[model samples]
Target: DAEFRHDSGYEVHHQKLVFFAEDVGSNKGAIIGLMVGGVV
Candidate 1:
């Protein structure tokens, strides 16, 4: 967690992305799927 929290502010950036996607379109579930799929 510490490393991620210090990883060039990516955590905050990720939050913005999640919200941004939701704001852009109706992809709450789709976004979750894509993010999880991409991460794994």
Candidate 2:
């Protein structure tokens, strides 16, 4: 039997290319967590 698997591989790949400007403050943390958790 095959095991079930789920992931946001595409989002992870995309986040790698995403860049946040220095002025974004707290928004950057939220974005990072969202991207990382989405991938996990």
Candidate 3:
């Protein structure tokens, strides 16, 4: 089977986040993780 979508400015398969406190902490971790991931 195939998929269908409406034509809008927003694209598909793109993820946005809900910013809660834990998400903030995880985002901080993600930022630092990205920093270290490539370098270390």
Candidate 4:
């Protein structure tokens, strides 16, 4: 069923955006945590 078409699947698209952002956050955390393996 085609749902949330009126809002252009806001939740659907937003979910993907957050999904990518989540991954970016993961890398960001690691980058700051290890600070490039402490060899910054």
Best by lDDT: 3
TM-score for all models, in order of appearance = 0.12, 0.16, 0.18, 0.11
Sorted on lDDT, highest at the top, how do the candidates line up? 3, 2, 1, 4
Order of all candidates by TM-score, from best down to worst? Answer: 3, 2, 1, 4
Candidate achieving the largest TM-score? 3
lDDT of each: 0.45, 0.56, 0.59, 0.45
The residue-by-residue lDDT of candidate 3 on 5-39, one tens digit each, is 57889676878888666454354443333443555
Model 1 agreement with the true structure over 1-40: per-residue lDDT tens digits: 5565443644353343343344564555643434334554
Residue pairs clashing in model 3 are: none
Better of 1 and 3 by TM-score: 3
lDDT of 2 by residue, 1-40 (tens): 8787786756554345666687654554443334434553
Model 3 alpha-carbon miss at residue 10, Å: 2.2
- Tell me the deviation in Å of residue 23 in model 1: 7.9
* Candidate 3 error regions (>4 Å): 1-7, 21-40
Residue 7 of model 1 has an lDDT of 39
How many backbone collisions does model 1 have? Answer: 0
TM-score of 4: 0.11
Please state the error at residue 4 of candidate 4 in Å.
28
